[PDB]
Amino acid sequence: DSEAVVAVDAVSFTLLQDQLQSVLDTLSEREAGVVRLRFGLTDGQPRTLDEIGQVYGVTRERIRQIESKTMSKLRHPSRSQVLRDYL
Amino acid sequence: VRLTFADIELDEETHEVWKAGQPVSLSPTEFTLLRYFVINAGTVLSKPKILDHVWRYDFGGDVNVVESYVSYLRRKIDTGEKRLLHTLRGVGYVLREPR
Amino acid sequence: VRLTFADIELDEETHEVWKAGQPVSLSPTEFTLLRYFVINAGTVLSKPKILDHVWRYDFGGDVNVVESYVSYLRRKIDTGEKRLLHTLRGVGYVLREPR
Amino acid sequence: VRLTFADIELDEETHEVWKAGQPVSLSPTEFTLLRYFVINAGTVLSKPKILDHVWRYDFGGDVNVVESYVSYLRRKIDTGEKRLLHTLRGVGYVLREPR
Numbered sequence A: 001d002s003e004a005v006v007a008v009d010a011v012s013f014t015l016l017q018d019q020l021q022s023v024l025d026t027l028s029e030r031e032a033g034v035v036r037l038r039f040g041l042t043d044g045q046p047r048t049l050d051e052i053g054q055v056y057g058v059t060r061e062r063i064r065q066i067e068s069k070t071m072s073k074l075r076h077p078s079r080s081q082v083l084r085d086y087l
Numbered sequence B, C, D: 001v002r003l004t005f006a007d008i009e010l011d012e013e014t015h016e017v018w019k020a021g022q023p024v025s026l027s028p029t030e031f032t033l034l035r036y037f038v039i040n041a042g043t044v045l046s047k048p049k050i051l052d053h054v055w056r057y058d059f060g061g062d063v064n065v066v067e068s069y070v071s072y073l074r075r076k077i078d079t080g081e082k083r084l085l086h087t088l089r090g091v092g093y094v095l096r097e098p099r
Helices: A009-026 A029-039 A049-056 A060-074 A077-084 B028-039 B047-053 B064-076 C028-039 C047-053 C064-076 D028-039 D047-053 D064-076
Strands: B003-005 B008-010 B017-019 B085-088 B092-095 C003-005 C008-011 C016-019 C085-088 C092-095 D003-005 D008-010 D017-019 D022-024 D085-088 D092-095
Touching (some): A009 A029, A060 A077, B028 B064, C003 C028, C008 C028, C028 C047, D003 D028, D028 D092
Antiparallel strands (some): B003 B008, C003 C008
C-alpha cells in the first residue's frame, strides 16, 4: 500500500518540525513570525508581503529587508549543520 | 596580483584604479563595490548579496544607496550611457564588455 | 558547466542565452522558464508543477500566464511553426528536438 | 638597506630621520608609525591595521590618538596643508607625492 504511512518518516517529521521551531526561536520573534507567515507554518497559507506589513504595520520593502536578515542569519553554519543532517 | 579588465585596471595595494590608463579618484565604498565587481567580472551581482558582503549586515537603511553608488560609478568611469557594468531589472548588475 | 540543447546555449553566470550563436536578451521570468526547461530537457513539465516551482506558491492568478510566456519563448527562439519546444494538451510543455 | 621616499629618508639602525636631508628628532611610538608608512610606501594605511600591528592589541584607548599622531606627522615633516601623507575618509592614510 503506497498510501500507507511508513511510520518512520512521520516520526522523523515530528522531530523535524521540533528542530525547526527550536532553530527559529533563536531568531528574533519578529523575524520568526515573518518566516512563519511567509511559508505558511502556523497555517497552510503562505502570505504575501503586504499581509505581513498590515499585520506588522510596516512597508513591504522593510519585510523584504527582514527576509534578507532571516535567510542570511539562517545561513550561519551553526544552524546549517544542525539542520543539514536531518535529510 | 593586479586585477585588470578591458579598460578598468585595479591595484590592491593602494586601492587606486586605472580607467584606460588615466588617473581617477573615487569614494571608498564605491571602490568596495567595484572590487566586488571585478572579482566577479562576468558574474551577475544582485543587490542582496552585495549588501550582505560589501555592506554591513546591520544595514537597516533604504535600498537606493546601491543604485546611487552605481550611478556614481557610471559618472566616474562609464561616461557613455551604454556601459560595461550592465543593470538587470530586479536581478542586479554585472561587468561585461559590450558585444 | 554551461547548459546546452540542440542549438540553445545557456550561461548561468551572467544570465544570457545563445540560439545557434546570435545575441539575445530575454525577460527575467521567461529566462527562469527557459532554465527550468533546459534543466529538465528530456522530462516533460506539467503546468501546475511549473507555477509551483519557478513561480511563487502564492500565485492566485489564472493559468493563461504560462501559455502567454511560452508563446513569448516560441516567438523568440522557435520562430518556425514547428518548434523544439513542443506542447502537450493538458500535460504541459517540454523541450524536444523533433524526430 | 636604507629606505628613502621622495624627500623622507629613514635609517633602521639608529632610528633617526632626514626630511630632505635635514635631521629631525621624533617620538619613539611615532617613529614606528612612519616605519609602517614607508614599509608600505605607495600603499594606503588604515587606522585599524595600524592599531593591530604597530600598537599592542591590549590598547583600550579611543580612536583620536592615531589621528593626533598623524597630525603630529603632519606638523613635523609634511608641514603643508597639502601633504604627501594623504587622508582617506574611513580608509586611513597613504604615502604618495601629489599628482
